[PDB]
Write a protein that holds these residues in place. Structure first.
Motif, mmCIF file in Angstrom:
data_model
loop_
_atom_site.group_PDB
_atom_site.id
_atom_site.type_symbol
_atom_site.label_atom_id
_atom_site.label_comp_id
_atom_site.label_asym_id
_atom_site.label_seq_id
_atom_site.Cartn_x
_atom_site.Cartn_y
_atom_site.Cartn_z
ATOM 1 N N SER A 1 0.607 -1.429 0.319
ATOM 2 C CA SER A 1 -0.047 -0.187 -0.120
ATOM 3 C C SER A 1 0.689 1.219 -0.054
ATOM 4 O O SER A 1 -0.113 2.245 -0.617
ATOM 5 N N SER A 2 1.921 1.456 0.804
ATOM 6 C CA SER A 2 3.189 2.574 0.703
ATOM 7 C C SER A 2 3.577 2.905 -0.339
ATOM 8 O O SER A 2 3.567 3.874 -1.550
ATOM 9 N N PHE A 3 3.858 1.377 -1.102
ATOM 10 C CA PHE A 3 4.646 1.742 -2.869
ATOM 11 C C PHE A 3 3.059 2.348 -3.365
ATOM 12 O O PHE A 3 3.837 3.533 -4.667
ATOM 13 N N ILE B 1 0.488 4.508 -2.439
ATOM 14 C CA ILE B 1 0.856 5.698 -2.228
ATOM 15 C C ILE B 1 1.701 6.448 -2.109
ATOM 16 O O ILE B 1 1.030 7.992 -2.563
ATOM 17 N N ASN B 2 2.848 6.807 -2.054
ATOM 18 C CA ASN B 2 4.273 7.172 -2.105
ATOM 19 C C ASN B 2 3.945 8.321 -3.849
ATOM 20 O O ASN B 2 4.359 8.324 -4.118
ATOM 21 N N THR C 1 1.781 9.058 -5.830
ATOM 22 C CA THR C 1 1.802 10.955 -6.150
ATOM 23 C C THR C 1 2.112 11.830 -5.163
ATOM 24 O O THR C 1 1.626 12.971 -5.823
ATOM 25 N N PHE D 1 11.622 8.912 3.403
ATOM 26 C CA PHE D 1 10.381 9.090 3.527
ATOM 27 C C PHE D 1 9.312 8.175 2.891
ATOM 28 O O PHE D 1 8.196 8.643 3.453
ATOM 29 N N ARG D 2 9.747 7.741 2.269
ATOM 30 C CA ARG D 2 8.786 6.443 1.244
ATOM 31 C C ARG D 2 7.744 5.556 2.385
ATOM 32 O O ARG D 2 6.395 5.905 2.834
ATOM 33 N N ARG D 3 8.353 5.216 3.302
ATOM 34 C CA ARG D 3 7.913 3.842 4.587
ATOM 35 C C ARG D 3 7.812 4.972 5.730
ATOM 36 O O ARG D 3 6.830 5.234 6.666
ATOM 37 N N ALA E 1 5.039 9.058 4.825
ATOM 38 C CA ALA E 1 3.612 8.570 3.954
ATOM 39 C C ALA E 1 2.771 9.272 3.966
ATOM 40 O O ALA E 1 2.176 9.761 4.033
ATOM 41 N N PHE F 1 -1.275 12.059 4.099
ATOM 42 C CA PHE F 1 -3.155 12.091 3.446
ATOM 43 C C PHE F 1 -4.556 11.757 4.792
ATOM 44 O O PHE F 1 -3.751 12.131 6.018
ATOM 45 N N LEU G 1 -8.338 2.332 3.334
ATOM 46 C CA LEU G 1 -7.448 1.493 2.920
ATOM 47 C C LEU G 1 -7.213 0.231 4.365
ATOM 48 O O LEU G 1 -7.510 -1.120 3.601
ATOM 49 N N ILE H 1 -4.945 0.149 7.182
ATOM 50 C CA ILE H 1 -3.867 -0.191 7.617
ATOM 51 C C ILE H 1 -3.628 0.765 8.718
ATOM 52 O O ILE H 1 -4.433 1.920 9.329
#
Ligand SMILES: Nc1ncnc2c1ncn2[C@@H]1O[C@H](COP(=O)(O)OP(=O)(O)OP(=O)(O)O)[C@@H](O)[C@H]1O
Ligand SMILES: Nc1ncnc2c1ncn2[C@@H]1O[C@H](COP(=O)(O)OP(=O)(O)OP(=O)(O)O)[C@@H](O)[C@H]1O
Ligand SMILES: Nc1ncnc2c1ncn2[C@@H]1O[C@H](COP(=O)(O)OP(=O)(O)O)[C@@H](O)[C@H]1O
Ligand SMILES: Nc1ncnc2c1ncn2[C@@H]1O[C@H](COP(=O)(O)OP(=O)(O)O)[C@@H](O)[C@H]1O
Ligand SMILES: [Mg+2]
Ligand SMILES: [Mg+2]
Lengths: 502, 502
Positions: free
Chosen positions: A222-224, A226-227, A229, B14-16, B19, B23, B31, B33
């Motif tokens: 899910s994180s993949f 989300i990041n 955008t 930052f990605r994990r 992020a 939102f 989602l 999570i």
């Protein structure tokens, strides 16, 4: 309901620990029996024990179960730890006095029980008093959870205390298929998942995961998405996850009970070239032994011994055989892991590795340089005996409940092992000799891209009469070429080095 | 933004880690999570970890991160240490009750985590209670920092607890180039930096510096300029930091992971003369190995053994080979470093040196007088086995992640080493002999400027038939010549001294 992969353990628990609670007290007293006040669940971590404990209580509409931790009690001051136990049962005592035998059920969950026994006694005595002694309380039901059953004293397992015991196993293929659905139910319910994702493929790709690992996998997937955008933006409503996201997220979670790929791959293999007919036979024997332990139920323990002179290529052969098998579980024990420890720590680590090896359908273990693990020096002679005895006992034990493993051990001190009299633990023996002919040297030079044939021929021509019967290994032969390649006169330098090596 | 040279690590973090916070809660609840609550960073000291934490803090506009030091809490009294941990989470707890799930993010930084395991249980249990137990808070995010990952037990690394782990490396060319610009931006933008200074040259001259060393270099350079206008004003308008100041300051700050120049240069080397062909051959072989290690991918570990009779001059050759290589990292282990310590101290020192060796692109290690490090005495014989096993294990381990080093060890007891069967740890062996011809004595006489050619030939003409076949080493010869020089009749004294030497 929320659980998946547990169907023959849900019926057994419900039949005994909860069946009698439904009926009115009149009939139960009519029969003349008593309720059970104990229950033990043991298994590896992250498998879904607390989940069962919390989910069962919802059916009976009991009070929310309280939770306590062993180390939490151990780490506090003596007086506070002594006093907490009585405080824990206050509400149950109040309710019983309030409403007689028609009181509601109360659940108390005790986590990491074994920590109390690892060395405390006041807690055990106080706990047993409330459930077995003349202060018996008829409202409680205690749940116990431990990762090691053998450390619990037998005094707690007699009738009247923790009378029923259950074991939880790692999920199989159907369990993983059910768990994926349970985890992605809500995501699927809102049209936020692409239609090209097939859960059957994921059930097979994830080979030895547990219940908890799949949650992390889904979270990373899910994180993949989300990041993708951010950098806070428009059109978030079109968000969707895809198969590529799962495939990429599969590279971030490395399960326990898995393959230690990095070591076996890099540290142990720096080339592999077939220069003789003996290597093919050795590899074919390895493949045959790998096959035997996958399609037969009369052999659940096979051990080998790969011996030979020093610098011959034993460890590389063992690693090469291990890599091509494809078993879910693979591990190695080598001196590099045990450097800098004390003896007790070494024993504990060695024991823990084997203990963890008994929880997968298939396993493979490597043991490198057995004579160094024992600290052998011939001057005394001096060596450690406890480690030797531990290894001797371990190399012949069979895994429980229709599981199987393959052990490969290497050594270079065959005579020393023969003296210690531990040579009856192995089922077969394989020998790895040196190089003894110029044709093998020619093959090695050809396959290593040394130089054109015009230069290759001259080295053999000179060595034919300079030294006819040289006896050198592969590791040193591959090192001489490397250093000779950088000289200004490679042809002469290679011969000069090889003459000394012989 | 303020940090240079860590783009990929920044993106991965930052990605994990952050992020999911951007939102709005609606989509995240959709989602199905949860947010992560742990993050671990490890690497060498002074590299920019807490800087990364602070800089990440501002983007989300969270509260100013708190910082707590491990030793501070650990050393404090038991009661105060137990009580003060609760103080850290007060604000986060209050804000949660105040504003539900819409509360702002709160960041807590824990420093020197591993120190707790180096011996404390209460602190760890209380910390885990807030992020894994039933009293979990949804506003916190705990950052961990350590330099040794191996000391942290695996229990803290499972999912739910510290779940994402990252490593920080020393900067390369581009990293130093960017850091210099980041540091000197303010000087440049105020017309206070001379135009003749070129930052690219400084980026290449500083070869193994970290982040903090560059700050120190800039501070020293500015101080150099500031000191030139005291013994006072009117220079506060034409104050510029020229190039000379940086070059002078380069001689003031000495980095770690550098060259121990004094020990290799002064104490070990006190002359080097070519009195024979074998010396040139040995030096050329050393150079060949040195340039082999630099330009290959197949050989990332080379070890050599240099041996000979006592007083042959072994250590000087190794030092001379090491000095001419030009590698960034150089160190030696000799008995002088281990004098006056206990066994455990020696083991720890060796382990720390070897661990430090594995953090630079290129390395060299020297080991002097191996038989002395083990406390060898032939009467018993008596020696230490633990140090021997540690050294035997350490001489085969390979550096991680495509790095390379060269080891050179010296000894004078080849037979003793043969008896301890540790001759398989070395790839090549070099033997250094003594002097056994008169022409070598004449060459050393010429080189040392003992006397004019007349007495030089006279001494040789006497010793030709006085004693034809003496056998003496260089070290004692250069001590006999020195004492003969200061007499009144050098020839008669020196001829007798040399004849006795045989
Ligand atoms: N056909 C081959 N068989 C074995 N080794 C090979 C072969 N081709 C190349 N090699 C190289 O041989 C080298 C031998 O190194 P290895 O670690 O296996 O030695 P070893 O026998 O375990 O040494 P030691 O006895 O000193 O522990 C490996 O690096 C591998 O790259
Ligand atoms: N070409 C040379 N080779 C070796 N040593 C030389 C040479 N020219 C001069 N020397 C001097 O030889 C002296 C003896 O060398 P060194 O001090 O390394 O002895 P060593 O062999 O390590 O001694 P020991 O066997 O007692 O440990 C050195 O001080 C060096 O100054
Ligand atoms: N068999 C299972 N089926 C579905 N979910 C599971 C299962 N096992 C674990 N999980 C998931 O993993 C999470 C953590 O489980 P956990 O409470 O750690 O179990 P335990 O601590 O007893 O190993 C739970 O929130 C649960 O959703
Ligand atoms: N990558 C970098 N870029 C710019 N400056 C840095 C970098 N790394 C460290 N520094 C500088 O070094 C100084 C000290 O760093 P520090 O916060 O002590 O890192 P750590 O806590 O990891 O040792 C900081 O003031 C910072 O300006
Ligand atoms: Mg080996
Ligand atoms: Mg010496």
């Amino acid at each position: 309901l929320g659980v998946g992969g547990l169907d023959k353990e849900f019926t057994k628990i419900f039949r005994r620990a909860f069946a009698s609670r439904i009926f009115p007290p009149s009939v139960i007293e009519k029969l003349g029996i008593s309720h059970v006040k104990g229950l033990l669940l043991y298994g590896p971590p992250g498998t879904g024990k607390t989940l069962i404990a919390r989910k069962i209580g919802t059916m009976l509409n009991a009070k929310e179960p309280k939770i306590v931790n062993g180390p939490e009690i151990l780490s506090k001051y003596v007086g506070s730890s002594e006093e907490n136990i009585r405080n824990l049962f206050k509400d149950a005592e109040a309710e019983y006095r309030a409403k007689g035998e028609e009181s509601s059920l109360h659940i108390i969950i005790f986590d990491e029980l074994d920590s109390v026994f690892k060395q405390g006694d006041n807690v055990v005595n106080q706990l047993l008093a409330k459930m077995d002694g003349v202060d018996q309380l008829n409202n409680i039901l205690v749940i116990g959870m431990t990762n090691r059953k053998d450390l619990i004293d037998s005094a707690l397992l007699r009738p009247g205390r923790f009378e029923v015991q259950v074991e939880i196993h790692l999920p199989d293929e159907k369990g993983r298929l059910q768990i994926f659905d349970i985890q992605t139910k809500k995501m699927r319910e809102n049209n936020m998942m692409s239609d090209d994702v097939n859960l059957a493929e994921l059930a097979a790709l994830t080979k030895n995961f547990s219940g908890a690992e799949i949650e992390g996998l889904v979270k990373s997937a899910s994180s993949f998405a989300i990041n993708k955008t951010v950098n806070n933006t428009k059109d978030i409503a079109k968000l969707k996850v895809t198969r590529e996201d799962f495939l990429n997220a599969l590279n971030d979670v490395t399960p326990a009970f898995g393959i230690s790929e990095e070591d076996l791959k890099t540290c142990v293999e720096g080339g592999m070239m077939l220069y003789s007919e003996r290597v093919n036979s050795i590899l074919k024997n390895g493949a045959r032994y790998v096959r035997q332990v996958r399609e037969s139920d009369k052999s659940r323990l096979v051990s080998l011994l790969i011996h030979g002179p020093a610098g011959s290529g034993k460890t590389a052969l063992a690693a090469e055989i291990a890599l091509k098998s494809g078993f879910p579980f693979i591990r190695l024990i080598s001196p590099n892991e045990l450097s800098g420890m004390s003896e007790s720590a070494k024993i504990a680590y060695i024991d823990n590795t084997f203990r963890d090896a008994y929880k997968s359908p298939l396993n493979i273990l490597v043991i490198d340089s057995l004579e160094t693990l024992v600290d052998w020096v011939p001057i005394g002679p001096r060596f450690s005996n406890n480690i030797l005895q531990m290894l001797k006992v371990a190399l012949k034990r069979k895994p429980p409940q229709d599981r199987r493993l393959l052990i490969m051990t290497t050594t270079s001190a065959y005579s020393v092992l023969q003296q210690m009299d531990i040579l009856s633990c192995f089922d077969n023996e394989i020998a790895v000799p040196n190089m003894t002919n110029l044709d093998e040297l020619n093959n090695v030079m050809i396959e290593s891209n040394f130089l054109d044939d015009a230069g290759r021929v001259k080295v053999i021509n000179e060595l034919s009469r300079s030294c006819p019967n040289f006896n050198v290994g592969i590791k040193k032969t591959l090192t001489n070429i490397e250093t000779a390649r950088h000289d200004e006169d490679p042809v002469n330098e290679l011969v000069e080095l090889m003459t000394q090596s012989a």
